[PDB]
Design a protein around this nucleic acid. Structure first.
Ligand code: 0L5
Ligand code: MG
Ligand code: MG
Ligand code: MG
Ligand code: MG
Ligand code: MG
Ligand code: MG
Length: 539
DNA sequence: GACCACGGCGCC
DNA sequence: AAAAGGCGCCGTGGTC
């Protein structure tokens, strides 16, 4: 390309280099643009940002997030990553996409701009005739990138002082647990080392091995194995308690307060748009899609996520979402009827599990039932189910039979999906998002059957993901108009922040947008809560 | 200081 | 651990 002075003309493709991967934390080291046989390199990258109308190119959203951080309204536009991801969701990195579709991801901005331009050309050509993938690009992925940029640049408020205090309390309880473990072992060792713990449990103490690890075949010390050993030795329960506390402390309580941004005073995640095999988003640096909520300490941590002074959090969560999607995809009359009548399969399963009437089912019990309901749907074994429920194998086997007997057209949809997947090489969501699964034709049964579970899960999980993405794209401009903010997405949940005076109105509108996004053969229902913290907003 | 593979585990 | 699926981050162990 012919070198030309900055600035580029409108429509140019951008290339940029960051000091680190996270756009909220990165220094913009270089900026360039390419169009019409020319490359334009910016002498001063930050000032040069002001010249662009949109970020068009590889990782466009990251540049937009940095621009928004700097107080510039620079929206992301075309991004070859999104085109590539729609063609094949194994396309997740610019290194891989570049190699596959015509170039090399280097560390120079001008080369990145040139690459973006030519990749766009080639990938756009590949989507010619792919009407359904093109619809996803234009109606979902491209506009969603703009929404995600705003979410990333906004961040969420965290009660740092509360977490710092919590750390000190948890540290004292961890000390009590570890001291007991070492007493019971008869000697100290590194309790954080599963290799050292394996030797203590299975060699030094008398305990029976229950299972083996996947890659290296060591005797497992997983929570599932320890659960099976609860009655065998007092050290086991102490280890389980130690694990719960150290997991929460090392992953959330200690690291999060150190990640507050100096300018915004908030915690900023990244929402990765080309990261999963099914079309789900992922969240990283830090992951805010796995904040604890199940246990009492986990709940205390979730309460640290709070609204800005004068604002409230609004949390919205699709009810039984993958079951509703399954009803639509499979067309099972019984399942469709369940949702037309307003029943709750999670509450029903929970009633059976704990042997209590539906009115007696508490939230933790219902959570337990969700694990069981989705476990069974996506192929859990009777053995595993029997162990997790602590019921005889025969009882677990029976539950699985009746589960599918109740909804007969589900297994037929699974078989049809797998057969088409074998022929075409891919399975697809309602909207035509594809996942390639070549191991459907594997000659090794365990491999093939694992592939089958991945394959029939994808249309369900992916359709639910598509629906949420479409809802975000529709909702965002409405929130902007009301002065509200979209903060987080957690798969089938959104967390918004609204001025107190408008929170009730925002909650109502968001619920309606989400429920009416793309009507199915069954109603979509959305549960909504409002609160000063994330935990209180979900109750 | 960094990378990796692994086991393990937090969420959906 | 066991025939649930989908993620990212932890510390360990080993290395570079
Ligand atoms: O926390 C637990 C275990 C509970 C404790 C175990 C027993 C304790 C008993 C104590 C008695 O005193 N389970 C986790 C629950 C959260 C979950 C989940 C999953 C979700 N999905 C998919 C399917 C689901 O539709 C979608 C969104 O998840 P949710 O929003 O949580 O589920 P939902 O939309 O189906 O139901 P809901 O929103 O109406 O609650 O993600 C899965 O595929 N697998 C899961 O395990
Ligand atoms: Mg839900
Ligand atoms: Mg949810
Ligand atoms: Mg209104
Ligand atoms: Mg190891
Ligand atoms: Mg792993
Ligand atoms: Mg699981």
């Amino acid at each position: 390309l012919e070198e030309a002075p900055w600035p580029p003309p409108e429509g140019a493709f951008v290339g940029f280099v960051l000091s680190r991967k996270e756009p909220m934390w990165a220094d913009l080291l270089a900026l360039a643009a390419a169009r019409g046989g020319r490359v334009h390199r910016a002498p001063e990258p930050y000032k040069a940002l002001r010249d662009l109308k949109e970020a068009r190119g590889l990782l466009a959203k990251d540049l937009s997030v940095l621009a928004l951080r700097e107080g510039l309204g620079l929206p992301p536009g075309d991004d070859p990553m999104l085109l590539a991801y729609l063609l094949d969701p194994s396309n997740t990195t610019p290194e891989g996409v570049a190699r596959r579709y015509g170039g090399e991801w280097t560390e120079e901005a001008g080369e990145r701009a040139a690459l973006s331009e030519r990749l766009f050309a080639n990938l756009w050509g590949r989507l010619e005739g792919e009407e359904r993938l093109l619809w996803l690009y234009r109606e979902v992925e491209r506009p969603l990138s703009a929404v995600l940029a705003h979410m990333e640049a906004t961040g969420v408020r965290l009660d740092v002082a509360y977490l710092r205090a919590l750390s000190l309390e948890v540290a004292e309880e961890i000390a009590r647990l570890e001291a007991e473990v070492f007493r019971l072992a008869g000697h100290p060792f590194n309790l954080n080392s599963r290799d050292q713990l394996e030797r203590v449990l299975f060699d030094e103490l008398g305990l029976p091995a229950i299972g083996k690890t996947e890659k290296t075949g060591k005797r497992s010390t997983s929570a599932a194995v320890l659960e099976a050993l609860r009655e065998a030795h007092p050290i086991v329960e102490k280890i389980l308690q130690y694990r719960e506390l150290t997991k929460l402390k090392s992953t959330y309580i200690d690291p999060l307060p150190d990640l507050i941004h100096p300018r915004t005073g908030r915690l900023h995640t990244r929402f990765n748009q080309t990261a999963t095999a099914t079309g789900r988003l992922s969240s990283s640096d830090p992951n805010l899609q796995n904040i604890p909520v199940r246990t009492p300490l986990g709940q205390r941590i979730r309460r640290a996520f709070i609204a800005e002074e004068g604002w409230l959090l609004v949390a919205l969560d699709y009810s039984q979402i993958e079951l509703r999607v399954l009803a639509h995809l499979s067309g099972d009359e019984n399942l469709i009827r369940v949702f037309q009548e307003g029943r709750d399969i999670h509450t029903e399963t929970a009633s059976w599990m704990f042997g209590v009437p539906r009115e007696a089912v508490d939230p933790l019990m219902r959570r337990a039932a969700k694990t069981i309901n989705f476990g069974v749907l996506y192929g859990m074994s009777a053995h595993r189910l029997s162990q997790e429920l602590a019921i005889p194998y025969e009882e677990a086997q029976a539950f699985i039979e009746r589960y599918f007997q109740s909804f007969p057209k589900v297994r037929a949809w699974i078989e049809k999906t797998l057969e088409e997947g074998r022929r075409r090489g891919y399975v697809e969501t309602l909207f035509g998002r594809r996942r390639y699964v070549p191991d459907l034709e594997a000659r090794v049964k365990s491999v093939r059957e694992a592939a089958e579970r991945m394959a029939f899960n994808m249309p369900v999980q992916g359709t639910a993901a598509d629906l949420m993405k479409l809802a975000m794209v529709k909702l965002f401009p409405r929130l902007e108009e009301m002065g509200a903010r979209m903060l987080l997405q957690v798969h089938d949940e959104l967390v918004l922040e609204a001025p107190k005076e408008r929170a009730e109105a925002v909650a109502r509108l968001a619920k309606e947008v989400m429920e009416g996004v793309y009507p199915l053969a069954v109603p979509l229902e959305v549960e909504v809560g409002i609160g000063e913290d994330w935990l209180s907003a979900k109750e």
